[PDB]
Design a protein around this nucleic acid. Structure first.
Ligand SMILES: [K+]
Ligand SMILES: [Mg+2]
Ligand SMILES: [Mg+2]
Ligand SMILES: [Mg+2]
Ligand SMILES: [Mg+2]
Ligand SMILES: [Mg+2]
Ligand SMILES: [Mg+2]
Ligand SMILES: [Mg+2]
Ligand SMILES: [Mg+2]
Ligand SMILES: [Mg+2]
Ligand SMILES: [Mg+2]
Ligand SMILES: [Mg+2]
Ligand SMILES: [Mg+2]
Ligand SMILES: [Mg+2]
Ligand SMILES: [Mg+2]
Ligand SMILES: [Mg+2]
Ligand SMILES: [Mg+2]
Ligand SMILES: [Mg+2]
Ligand SMILES: [Mg+2]
Ligand SMILES: [Mg+2]
Ligand SMILES: [Mg+2]
Ligand SMILES: [Mg+2]
Ligand SMILES: [Mg+2]
Ligand SMILES: [Mg+2]
Ligand SMILES: [Mg+2]
Ligand SMILES: [Mg+2]
Ligand SMILES: [Mg+2]
Ligand SMILES: [Mg+2]
Ligand SMILES: [Mg+2]
Ligand SMILES: [Mg+2]
Ligand SMILES: [Mg+2]
Ligand SMILES: [Mg+2]
Ligand SMILES: [Mg+2]
Ligand SMILES: [Mg+2]
Ligand SMILES: [Mg+2]
Ligand SMILES: [Mg+2]
Ligand SMILES: [Mg+2]
Ligand SMILES: [Mg+2]
Ligand SMILES: [Mg+2]
Ligand SMILES: [Mg+2]
Ligand SMILES: [Mg+2]
Ligand SMILES: [Mg+2]
Ligand SMILES: [Mg+2]
Ligand SMILES: [Mg+2]
Ligand SMILES: [Mg+2]
Ligand SMILES: [Mg+2]
Ligand SMILES: [Mg+2]
Ligand SMILES: [Mg+2]
Ligand SMILES: [Mg+2]
Ligand SMILES: [Mg+2]
Ligand SMILES: [Mg+2]
Ligand SMILES: [Mg+2]
Ligand SMILES: [Mg+2]
Ligand SMILES: [Mg+2]
Ligand SMILES: [Mg+2]
Ligand SMILES: [Mg+2]
Ligand SMILES: [Mg+2]
Ligand SMILES: [Mg+2]
Ligand SMILES: [Mg+2]
Ligand SMILES: [Mg+2]
Ligand SMILES: [Mg+2]
Ligand SMILES: [Mg+2]
Ligand SMILES: [Mg+2]
Ligand SMILES: [Mg+2]
Ligand SMILES: [Mg+2]
Ligand SMILES: [Mg+2]
Ligand SMILES: [Mg+2]
Ligand SMILES: [Mg+2]
Ligand SMILES: [Mg+2]
Ligand SMILES: [Mg+2]
Ligand SMILES: [Mg+2]
Ligand SMILES: [Mg+2]
Ligand SMILES: [Mg+2]
Ligand SMILES: [Mg+2]
Ligand SMILES: [Mg+2]
Ligand SMILES: [Mg+2]
Ligand SMILES: [Mg+2]
Ligand SMILES: [Mg+2]
Ligand SMILES: [Mg+2]
Ligand SMILES: [Mg+2]
Ligand SMILES: [Mg+2]
Ligand SMILES: [Mg+2]
Ligand SMILES: [Mg+2]
Ligand SMILES: [Mg+2]
Ligand SMILES: [Mg+2]
Ligand SMILES: [Mg+2]
Ligand SMILES: [Mg+2]
Ligand SMILES: [Mg+2]
Ligand SMILES: [Mg+2]
Ligand SMILES: [Mg+2]
Ligand SMILES: [Mg+2]
Ligand SMILES: [Mg+2]
Ligand SMILES: [Mg+2]
Ligand SMILES: [Mg+2]
Ligand SMILES: [Mg+2]
Ligand SMILES: [Mg+2]
Ligand SMILES: [Mg+2]
Ligand SMILES: [Mg+2]
Ligand SMILES: [Mg+2]
Ligand SMILES: [Mg+2]
Ligand SMILES: [Mg+2]
Ligand SMILES: [Mg+2]
Ligand SMILES: [Mg+2]
Ligand SMILES: [Mg+2]
Ligand SMILES: [Mg+2]
Ligand SMILES: [Mg+2]
Ligand SMILES: [Mg+2]
Ligand SMILES: [Mg+2]
Ligand SMILES: [Mg+2]
Ligand SMILES: [Mg+2]
Ligand SMILES: [Mg+2]
Ligand SMILES: [Mg+2]
Ligand SMILES: [Mg+2]
Ligand SMILES: [Mg+2]
Ligand SMILES: [Mg+2]
Ligand SMILES: [Mg+2]
Ligand SMILES: [Mg+2]
Ligand SMILES: [Mg+2]
Ligand SMILES: [Mg+2]
Ligand SMILES: [Mg+2]
Ligand SMILES: [Mg+2]
Ligand SMILES: [Mg+2]
Ligand SMILES: [Mg+2]
Ligand SMILES: [Mg+2]
Ligand SMILES: [Mg+2]
Ligand SMILES: [Mg+2]
Ligand SMILES: [Mg+2]
Ligand SMILES: [Mg+2]
Ligand SMILES: [Mg+2]
Ligand SMILES: [Mg+2]
Ligand SMILES: [Mg+2]
Ligand SMILES: [Mg+2]
Ligand SMILES: [Mg+2]
Ligand SMILES: [Mg+2]
Ligand SMILES: [Mg+2]
Ligand SMILES: [Mg+2]
Ligand SMILES: [Mg+2]
Ligand SMILES: [Mg+2]
Ligand SMILES: [Mg+2]
Ligand SMILES: [Mg+2]
Ligand SMILES: [Mg+2]
Ligand SMILES: [Mg+2]
Ligand SMILES: [Mg+2]
Ligand SMILES: [Mg+2]
Ligand SMILES: [Mg+2]
Ligand SMILES: [Mg+2]
Ligand SMILES: [Mg+2]
Ligand SMILES: [Mg+2]
Ligand SMILES: [Mg+2]
Ligand SMILES: [Mg+2]
Ligand SMILES: [Mg+2]
Ligand SMILES: [Mg+2]
Ligand SMILES: [Mg+2]
Ligand SMILES: [Mg+2]
Ligand SMILES: [Mg+2]
Ligand SMILES: [Mg+2]
Ligand SMILES: [Mg+2]
Ligand SMILES: [Mg+2]
Ligand SMILES: [Mg+2]
Ligand SMILES: [Mg+2]
Ligand SMILES: [Mg+2]
Ligand SMILES: [Mg+2]
Ligand SMILES: [Mg+2]
Ligand SMILES: [Mg+2]
Ligand SMILES: [Mg+2]
Ligand SMILES: [Mg+2]
Ligand SMILES: [Mg+2]
Ligand SMILES: [Mg+2]
Ligand SMILES: [Mg+2]
Ligand SMILES: [Mg+2]
Ligand SMILES: [Mg+2]
Ligand SMILES: [Mg+2]
Ligand SMILES: [Mg+2]
Ligand SMILES: [Mg+2]
Ligand SMILES: [Mg+2]
Ligand SMILES: [Mg+2]
Ligand SMILES: [Mg+2]
Ligand SMILES: [Mg+2]
Ligand SMILES: [Mg+2]
Ligand SMILES: [Mg+2]
Ligand SMILES: [Mg+2]
Ligand SMILES: [Mg+2]
Ligand SMILES: [Mg+2]
Ligand SMILES: [Mg+2]
Ligand SMILES: [Mg+2]
Ligand SMILES: [Mg+2]
Ligand SMILES: [Mg+2]
Ligand SMILES: [Mg+2]
Ligand SMILES: [Mg+2]
Ligand SMILES: [Mg+2]
Ligand SMILES: [Mg+2]
Ligand SMILES: [Mg+2]
Ligand SMILES: [Mg+2]
Ligand SMILES: [Mg+2]
Ligand SMILES: [Mg+2]
Ligand SMILES: [Mg+2]
Ligand SMILES: [Mg+2]
Ligand SMILES: [Mg+2]
Ligand SMILES: [Mg+2]
Ligand SMILES: [Mg+2]
Ligand SMILES: [Mg+2]
Ligand SMILES: [Mg+2]
Ligand SMILES: [Mg+2]
Ligand SMILES: [Mg+2]
Ligand SMILES: [Mg+2]
Ligand SMILES: [Mg+2]
Ligand SMILES: [Mg+2]
Ligand SMILES: [Mg+2]
Ligand SMILES: [Mg+2]
Ligand SMILES: [Mg+2]
Ligand SMILES: [Mg+2]
Ligand SMILES: [Mg+2]
Ligand SMILES: [Mg+2]
Ligand SMILES: [Mg+2]
Ligand SMILES: [Mg+2]
Ligand SMILES: [Mg+2]
Ligand SMILES: [Mg+2]
Ligand SMILES: [Mg+2]
Ligand SMILES: [Mg+2]
Ligand SMILES: [Mg+2]
Ligand SMILES: [Mg+2]
Ligand SMILES: [Mg+2]
Ligand SMILES: [Mg+2]
Ligand SMILES: [Mg+2]
Ligand SMILES: [Mg+2]
Ligand SMILES: [Mg+2]
Ligand SMILES: [Mg+2]
Ligand SMILES: [Mg+2]
Ligand SMILES: [Mg+2]
Ligand SMILES: [Mg+2]
Ligand SMILES: [Mg+2]
Ligand SMILES: [Mg+2]
Ligand SMILES: [Mg+2]
Ligand SMILES: [Mg+2]
Ligand SMILES: [Mg+2]
Ligand SMILES: [Mg+2]
Ligand SMILES: [Mg+2]
Ligand SMILES: [Mg+2]
Ligand SMILES: [Mg+2]
Ligand SMILES: [Mg+2]
Ligand SMILES: [Mg+2]
Ligand SMILES: [Mg+2]
Ligand SMILES: [Mg+2]
Ligand SMILES: [Mg+2]
Ligand SMILES: [Mg+2]
Ligand SMILES: [Mg+2]
Ligand SMILES: [Mg+2]
Ligand SMILES: [Mg+2]
Ligand SMILES: [Mg+2]
Ligand SMILES: [Mg+2]
Ligand SMILES: [Mg+2]
Ligand SMILES: [Mg+2]
Ligand SMILES: [Mg+2]
Ligand SMILES: [Mg+2]
Ligand SMILES: [Mg+2]
Ligand SMILES: [Mg+2]
Ligand SMILES: [Mg+2]
Ligand SMILES: [Mg+2]
Ligand SMILES: [Mg+2]
Ligand SMILES: [Mg+2]
Ligand SMILES: [Mg+2]
Lengths: 48, 275, 7
RNA sequence: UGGUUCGUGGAGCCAUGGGGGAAUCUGGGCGGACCACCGCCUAAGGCUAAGUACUCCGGGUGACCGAUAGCGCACCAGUAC
RNA sequence: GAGCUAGCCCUGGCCAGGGUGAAGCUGGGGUGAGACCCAGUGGAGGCCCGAACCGGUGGGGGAUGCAAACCCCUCGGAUGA
RNA sequence: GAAUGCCGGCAUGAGUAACGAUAAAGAGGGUGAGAAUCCCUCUCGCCGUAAGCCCAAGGGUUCCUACGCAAUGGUCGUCAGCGUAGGGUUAGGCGGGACCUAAGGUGAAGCCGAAAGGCGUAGCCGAAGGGCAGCCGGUUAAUAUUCCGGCCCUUCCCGCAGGUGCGAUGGGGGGACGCUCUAGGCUAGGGGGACCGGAGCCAUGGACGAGCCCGGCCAGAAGCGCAGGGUGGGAGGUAGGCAAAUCCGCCUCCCAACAAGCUCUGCGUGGUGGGGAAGCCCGGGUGACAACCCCCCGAAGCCAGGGAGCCAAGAAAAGCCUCUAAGCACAACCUGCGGGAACCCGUACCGCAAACCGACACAGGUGGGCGGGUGCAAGAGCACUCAGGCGCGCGGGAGAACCCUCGCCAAGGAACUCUGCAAGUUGGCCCCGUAACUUCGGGAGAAGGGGUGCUCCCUGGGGUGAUGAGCCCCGGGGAGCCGCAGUGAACAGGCUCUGGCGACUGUUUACCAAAAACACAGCUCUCUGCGAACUCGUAAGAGGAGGUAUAGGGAGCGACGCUUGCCCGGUGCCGGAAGGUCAAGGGGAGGGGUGCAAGCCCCGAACCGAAGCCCCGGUGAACGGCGGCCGUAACUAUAACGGUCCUAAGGUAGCGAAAUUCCUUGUCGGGUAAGUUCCGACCUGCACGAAAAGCGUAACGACCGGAGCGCUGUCUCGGCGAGGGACCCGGUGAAAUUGAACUGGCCGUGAAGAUGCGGCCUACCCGUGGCAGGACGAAAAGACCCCGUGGAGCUUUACUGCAGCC
RNA sequence: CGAUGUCGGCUCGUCGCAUCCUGGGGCUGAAGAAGGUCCCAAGGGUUGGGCUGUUCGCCCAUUAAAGCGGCACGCGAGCUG
RNA sequence: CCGAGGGUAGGGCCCGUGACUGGGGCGAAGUCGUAACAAGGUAGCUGUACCGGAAGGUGCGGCUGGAU
RNA sequence: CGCGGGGUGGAGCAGCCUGGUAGCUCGUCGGGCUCAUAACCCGAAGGUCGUCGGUUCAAAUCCGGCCCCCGCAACCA
């Protein structure tokens, strides 16, 4: 049957992407925390 | 004269359709239509703020001349009468001797090829617009401005009309379509005659889908819901209201008046409505 | 399913 | 209404959202309602080191751990997944 | 978090084939004129049968599954909300 | 040493289940250390509106080639989507960007909010919509509308020539639009040929034939031909298109009009360039100077912005054209030609799947296009096949029980069972024929029947063509033939009678309920005069609605028919300028503290003083509610009638043992041999009843009840047969569970149901196929139940607050 | 109560005897035939249907008879539901 | 080929019969009330409508076959 | 022996709460009006309060047992 993950590159970049995060106080906290934790990736991978 | 159908489907038993026999032109003036942004009853937050809306036929909005004092003195010819999917009345296309083309609400008995005109000096004649102070007492009038220059606000639905009952200083006394008696400023414009398509109220939609064509999604009774949803929700089996009949939001809905008491227009409402 | 409904 | 030990208390003091609304020392505030007396202090402008706090960083030292412990990671770990 | 699911908005796409035969129109009849009747034409409909497509009615299987909802037979809708 | 403890290691179950669609395999040759599993050949089988082909998502080197086989692959492995290395994606014309706008997003101006932030016109962004110039072939191991070949085309720059009032983010035109049905002419695609081209073949009884088999085209600029779309010309006026306008709009006038003219597509033709089969021989080469023609069928595609009808009334913006403003007319634009210039990103491969979403090479899920042929009425259905692609990554045997899926069955035919559940039956087409009832549509495919193949002969109409032949499409009549049987296989209703419920088509508990539930047209009540009411938001702002009482919100009812009674005392809502009560505030009788005093300070009665409440009325498709006891008629029985008590008023019509009836299988009637169900009645209705509507109702229903016919393996009652498993051999090899075990029966005992205690009995040791009585078997710290001064959802005239409103 | 699945049916039995039938008896208000009642006796047998989920029961047609009870109201790691 | 008739299926007409149900006629001395006949004590009758244990009442319109 | 309500002239209802006082309508009987009946008018009679027992100076009244008669309830399985 149809499952929950239906990959869509435009959707991924526009929802979780760097510029979405930067536009919102909550998004900037996400990046701030992920930098402080040392994440190799701040934002999900999507090829565009 | 509404049209009927032989019972060749269960729904055609009851469906009636407007006869459209007054319509002379069946596509709209391209320079006077604009896109009608459908809303689904959603506001600018995205929230439904008027339940059960959406899904209706696509529509172009026709720009209607609700002022008419725009062009005092300039006779126009009635060029065509057309269908308008954004209102109950029909609309009439005027070709002004100016060259300018405008739409107005089509009053009852207006004919292609006649001439209408707006202003203090306009003949007391169906389709002419005048300031209320110059229309003689007793005249049946429509497309009435509610304050001078703010645009025709009253009696615009198919079949409606307002009757001039008297004068009092700068103000005239109208009997509105509701039966309310109200003071309206003498300098307010109105158009002689009643709105046309008076048979509109006799249409029998006939089937559920026909409501869906109009953008009306199904209405669900509060008594069909659960307590989290509605005052009338819940209960084992069916249930009477069990409390004063209420809206989804809890206010009473059988008689509870809701006009604001301290409203300034109260000084101008002579008699509340009827029936 | 679930349990035997001993009710 | 807040603050203070003060939760309306005899409730002052400091602060102030609303209304009313002064005076320039013979002016004004305070000493826990209020009044007298006796004293203290000068509101509605601003600035000001040091002693104080913290440990990303560096070093020193442990009746601290010693690879299931000690940081989540002694190791290509905020990785693989 | 609405890449699942619910509703709405914008823009596109899809619906084999067959059956029934509404209004209207033409002609004929009818009458003072009408209503109306017959035939032809016409091609309406949350119309009929049935694939795609959308479903999930009954039963059987599956039940550490092929599958954390599937498989087989059967069955509903299929120009419309 | 225990915490269903934590982390890890290793056991048991067990050589057990399983190895992932029952589309299927066999053999020969090759390679190699090794071969059912890799390569080649022949045979066989499966898909073929796909299980073939092409796009788009998504994936991201999985592509090609060489060398590999530890692991991955459910077995094997020499193979591979695996490991190592090298190679591979070529564009002015395809797609996206240097173009346009849509929802929406963002947002100079502006608005709002403690902060963060929320809005917001223009503008900007935003596509699978608008716009815009490339077709056919060849070539690589791997890319090709991209490289190459042939023939075309677009934009930008610069020059030359001719022409012109040139010039725009501004004005206007256009772009520009629905649903259904559909004309003419074409193309795609396909069928046929006695004509053209071709390596060959003659078999096994016959055929050297007007025989079999294969093929018989593709692209193409200007020109021309066919078919279409678009499009009036001229003059005068002019105040409107937010300046101007010679444009457009309006008025008048002349001429032209089912035309024509001009213009724009599509198809055909067209210089030229291509392609080219079977077969044969080793992807190639030959065939081959291959031929490339005639007839038919024919789109849902094309001409297209075509036509008609209908109501639910069907994007924007740019490109483009035209008008003029600043400016400029040494410019500038238009037309023609010439040279030059033309950037960025994608392009491999998979793509209904072993490469995407499902932890797996997972029977699931995934949008668009092509999807051949024959027959079956048609069709994308069904059967078999083309092209093409596969036999599903464990096999070999055996032929037990039992399971699955499937076939048949004597006599009976629902006797099965909660239930005809399941499975039979029926089944397409043509014709004959068809009932109650009905809202006149229907009910209806009602029911029930007859026909269906093949051969010969006669004949009617249409399409193409020419009116004929030929091809093709619809028929009619007559005479025959064969079989058990002619929709001969495959696909393809069982029917009727009668209730309940719901009018109907729809909708729902993704994943135990599809329903009588929700919805639905329609009915009624009620709010709302527009800066509407109502809704979201602190606000701004939005929705409502660019709507205006024939409109919009809320509530209930639920097509339609006939109807919808009595009660306003309580609650609600509506009305009521009196009266009562009522807060802050006003007022200040009279008191109190302090001071020598002027004063300062505090308390404070009468009185004025809103909404709300009380009080007076109204109101039922507002919440709701609609009695009791006793007596009475000339047989009896029963009471039309009376008495009395109570209430705000005592349930009307209609219906009733009912989706409601406890006593109950009420009573009687029907149906049956027999009927706790069903149907029709009666009425002492435990406990119907009129918009939480009452009683009916044609049609409708994968709804629920009852009956009958048809037919059946449901059953009496079971039998046999098929295949996939189960079993055996080779390969690979889990699981929950498990205190340890050397783990029998009875009768007792025991915490009350004992393999484990007592007494007796019985019993050599160890497995394999089976069956499920026990191990109070496994699974899940019982959902029921209770308990906890545990939790959460929900309600209200519980308490207390807050929004909101007054 | 860190679960002893709970009615009825179907299937499969097995046991008790307070015996329904069949066999053996006594007494009889036992003429015969047929019964009544009690004693002994558990070897075997103890039907098919209509109704209801039903157990039970009533009904139909038979029968030698259409027994009553236990086995976790025997039997859901056997099925149904 | 036709064909008595037999069979299957579906209609139409008529007769009889049915729990129960509707009103009708009749029946020496039942119970309720008093509608009509006099102005019958509300003139009556009337078509229709609605209501009520029962006659009846009331509305609308009509008749005189209505009295003084 | 689950929980309520009730028993008083002939019928139907007060009086019980708060102990001393039996009351209302109809009915029944005598008279009147009428030709007669009904209606109507004038008079009158009839209840030791279901029962037994207790408290009290005194019980329909208050308390306990019994009799009778209506109403409610009987849930989780
Ligand atoms: K319970
Ligand atoms: Mg889904
Ligand atoms: Mg998606
Ligand atoms: Mg994307
Ligand atoms: Mg995308
Ligand atoms: Mg997206
Ligand atoms: Mg976003
Ligand atoms: Mg982003
Ligand atoms: Mg911030
Ligand atoms: Mg990470
Ligand atoms: Mg890094
Ligand atoms: Mg992130
Ligand atoms: Mg109609
Ligand atoms: Mg009709
Ligand atoms: Mg009209
Ligand atoms: Mg426009
Ligand atoms: Mg809007
Ligand atoms: Mg917005
Ligand atoms: Mg709303
Ligand atoms: Mg809405
Ligand atoms: Mg209109
Ligand atoms: Mg409207
Ligand atoms: Mg006004
Ligand atoms: Mg209507
Ligand atoms: Mg609409
Ligand atoms: Mg509606
Ligand atoms: Mg509704
Ligand atoms: Mg509900
Ligand atoms: Mg509900
Ligand atoms: Mg919610
Ligand atoms: Mg709540
Ligand atoms: Mg609520
Ligand atoms: Mg409720
Ligand atoms: Mg409910
Ligand atoms: Mg209920
Ligand atoms: Mg409910
Ligand atoms: Mg209630
Ligand atoms: Mg309420
Ligand atoms: Mg309100
Ligand atoms: Mg009003
Ligand atoms: Mg404090
Ligand atoms: Mg204080
Ligand atoms: Mg001083
Ligand atoms: Mg001072
Ligand atoms: Mg101070
Ligand atoms: Mg001080
Ligand atoms: Mg001081
Ligand atoms: Mg100071
Ligand atoms: Mg140590
Ligand atoms: Mg370690
Ligand atoms: Mg560690
Ligand atoms: Mg350690
Ligand atoms: Mg570290
Ligand atoms: Mg560190
Ligand atoms: Mg660690
Ligand atoms: Mg690592
Ligand atoms: Mg989604
Ligand atoms: Mg369709
Ligand atoms: Mg026809
Ligand atoms: Mg027509
Ligand atoms: Mg349909
Ligand atoms: Mg049909
Ligand atoms: Mg589904
Ligand atoms: Mg079935
Ligand atoms: Mg499952
Ligand atoms: Mg099937
Ligand atoms: Mg269809
Ligand atoms: Mg269908
Ligand atoms: Mg639609
Ligand atoms: Mg211990
Ligand atoms: Mg464990
Ligand atoms: Mg633990
Ligand atoms: Mg552990
Ligand atoms: Mg380890
Ligand atoms: Mg472990
Ligand atoms: Mg291990
Ligand atoms: Mg071991
Ligand atoms: Mg082992
Ligand atoms: Mg075993
Ligand atoms: Mg297994
Ligand atoms: Mg398996
Ligand atoms: Mg299969
Ligand atoms: Mg199979
Ligand atoms: Mg197959
Ligand atoms: Mg082989
Ligand atoms: Mg091999
Ligand atoms: Mg090998
Ligand atoms: Mg194989
Ligand atoms: Mg091979
Ligand atoms: Mg061979
Ligand atoms: Mg991947
Ligand atoms: Mg390997
Ligand atoms: Mg290997
Ligand atoms: Mg190696
Ligand atoms: Mg492996
Ligand atoms: Mg595998
Ligand atoms: Mg090798
Ligand atoms: Mg490559
Ligand atoms: Mg190129
Ligand atoms: Mg550039
Ligand atoms: Mg743009
Ligand atoms: Mg704020
Ligand atoms: Mg964007
Ligand atoms: Mg685009
Ligand atoms: Mg468009
Ligand atoms: Mg080209
Ligand atoms: Mg090509
Ligand atoms: Mg020019
Ligand atoms: Mg247009
Ligand atoms: Mg438009
Ligand atoms: Mg072509
Ligand atoms: Mg063909
Ligand atoms: Mg060749
Ligand atoms: Mg050659
Ligand atoms: Mg199409
Ligand atoms: Mg087109
Ligand atoms: Mg058209
Ligand atoms: Mg329409
Ligand atoms: Mg726009
Ligand atoms: Mg100039
Ligand atoms: Mg010059
Ligand atoms: Mg560039
Ligand atoms: Mg490529
Ligand atoms: Mg698929
Ligand atoms: Mg693959
Ligand atoms: Mg997942
Ligand atoms: Mg596989
Ligand atoms: Mg072909
Ligand atoms: Mg067919
Ligand atoms: Mg296979
Ligand atoms: Mg397969
Ligand atoms: Mg074997
Ligand atoms: Mg046979
Ligand atoms: Mg048989
Ligand atoms: Mg039979
Ligand atoms: Mg039979
Ligand atoms: Mg049966
Ligand atoms: Mg059932
Ligand atoms: Mg069959
Ligand atoms: Mg068939
Ligand atoms: Mg009929
Ligand atoms: Mg019938
Ligand atoms: Mg019938
Ligand atoms: Mg009927
Ligand atoms: Mg009919
Ligand atoms: Mg038939
Ligand atoms: Mg028929
Ligand atoms: Mg025949
Ligand atoms: Mg034959
Ligand atoms: Mg024969
Ligand atoms: Mg069928
Ligand atoms: Mg329904
Ligand atoms: Mg329903
Ligand atoms: Mg109904
Ligand atoms: Mg109905
Ligand atoms: Mg439908
Ligand atoms: Mg469900
Ligand atoms: Mg569920
Ligand atoms: Mg679920
Ligand atoms: Mg289900
Ligand atoms: Mg359900
Ligand atoms: Mg259904
Ligand atoms: Mg529902
Ligand atoms: Mg309905
Ligand atoms: Mg209404
Ligand atoms: Mg709000
Ligand atoms: Mg608006
Ligand atoms: Mg209705
Ligand atoms: Mg409903
Ligand atoms: Mg009717
Ligand atoms: Mg009534
Ligand atoms: Mg009242
Ligand atoms: Mg009331
Ligand atoms: Mg009231
Ligand atoms: Mg007041
Ligand atoms: Mg009440
Ligand atoms: Mg109530
Ligand atoms: Mg009854
Ligand atoms: Mg009933
Ligand atoms: Mg009931
Ligand atoms: Mg009963
Ligand atoms: Mg019962
Ligand atoms: Mg019975
Ligand atoms: Mg009977
Ligand atoms: Mg019945
Ligand atoms: Mg009775
Ligand atoms: Mg109700
Ligand atoms: Mg109800
Ligand atoms: Mg009914
Ligand atoms: Mg019905
Ligand atoms: Mg019906
Ligand atoms: Mg249905
Ligand atoms: Mg249904
Ligand atoms: Mg049945
Ligand atoms: Mg039956
Ligand atoms: Mg069988
Ligand atoms: Mg077999
Ligand atoms: Mg062996
Ligand atoms: Mg092995
Ligand atoms: Mg292995
Ligand atoms: Mg041991
Ligand atoms: Mg041992
Ligand atoms: Mg043992
Ligand atoms: Mg043993
Ligand atoms: Mg015991
Ligand atoms: Mg024992
Ligand atoms: Mg033992
Ligand atoms: Mg021992
Ligand atoms: Mg011992
Ligand atoms: Mg022992
Ligand atoms: Mg022993
Ligand atoms: Mg023994
Ligand atoms: Mg074995
Ligand atoms: Mg075994
Ligand atoms: Mg066992
Ligand atoms: Mg068992
Ligand atoms: Mg056991
Ligand atoms: Mg246990
Ligand atoms: Mg057990
Ligand atoms: Mg479980
Ligand atoms: Mg726990
Ligand atoms: Mg527990
Ligand atoms: Mg639990
Ligand atoms: Mg308990
Ligand atoms: Mg407590
Ligand atoms: Mg406690
Ligand atoms: Mg608690
Ligand atoms: Mg328990
Ligand atoms: Mg346990
Ligand atoms: Mg357990
Ligand atoms: Mg059985
Ligand atoms: Mg004898
Ligand atoms: Mg004896
Ligand atoms: Mg025996
Ligand atoms: Mg029974
Ligand atoms: Mg019984
Ligand atoms: Mg006998
Ligand atoms: Mg027993
Ligand atoms: Mg028992
Ligand atoms: Mg029992
Ligand atoms: Mg029991
Ligand atoms: Mg059992
Ligand atoms: Mg079970
Ligand atoms: Mg059971
Ligand atoms: Mg068990
Ligand atoms: Mg067990
Ligand atoms: Mg059940
Ligand atoms: Mg015969
Ligand atoms: Mg008498
Ligand atoms: Mg009278
Ligand atoms: Mg009389
Ligand atoms: Mg009279
Ligand atoms: Mg009288
Ligand atoms: Mg009356
Ligand atoms: Mg009495
Ligand atoms: Mg009392
Ligand atoms: Mg007293
Ligand atoms: Mg008395
Ligand atoms: Mg007397
Ligand atoms: Mg008398
Ligand atoms: Mg006394």
């Amino acid at each position: 049957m149809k499952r929950t993950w239906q990959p869509n590159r435009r959707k991924r970049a526009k929802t979780h992407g760097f510029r979405a995060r930067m536009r919102t106080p909550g998004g900037r906290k996400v990046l701030k925390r992920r930098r402080q934790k040392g994440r190799w990736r701040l934002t999900p991978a999507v090829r565009k | 004269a509404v049209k009927k159908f032989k019972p060749y489907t269960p729904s055609r038993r009851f469906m009636t359709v407007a006869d459209f026999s007054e319509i002379t032109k069946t596509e709209p003036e391209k320079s006077l239509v604009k896109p009608l942004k459908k809303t689904g009853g959603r506001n600018n937050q995205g929230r439904i703020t008027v339940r059960f809306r959406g899904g209706g036929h696509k529509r172009l909005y026709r720009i209607i001349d609700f002022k008419r004092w725009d062009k005092v003195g300039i006779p126009a010819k009635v060029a065509a009468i057309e269908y308008d999917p954004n209102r109950s009345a029909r609309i009439a296309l005027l070709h002004y001797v100016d060259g300018e083309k405008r739409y107005i609400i089509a009053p009852d008995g207006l004919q292609v090829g006649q001439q209408v005109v707006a202003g203090p000096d306009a003949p007391i004649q169906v389709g002419n617009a005048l300031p209320l102070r110059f229309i003689p007492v007793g005249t049946v009038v429509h497309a009435v401005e509610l304050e001078p220059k703010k645009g025709a606000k009253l009696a615009r639905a198919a079949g409606t009309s307002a009757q001039i009952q008297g004068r009092e200083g700068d103000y005239v006394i109208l009997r509105l379509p509701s039966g309310e008696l109200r003071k309206v400023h003498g300098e307010c414009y109105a158009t002689v005659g009643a709105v046309g398509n008076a048979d509109h109220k006799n249409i029998v939609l006939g089937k559920a889908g026909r409501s869906r064509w109009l953008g009306r999604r199904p209405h669900v009774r509060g008594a069909a819901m659960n307590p989290v949803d509605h005052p009338h929700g819940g209960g084992e089996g069916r249930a009477p209201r069990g409390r004063p009949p209420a809206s989804p939001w809890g206010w009473q809905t059988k008689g509870l008046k809701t006009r604001k008491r301290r409203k300034p227009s109260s000084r101008f409402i002579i008699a509340r409505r009827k029936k | 399913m679930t349990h035997s409904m001993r009710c």
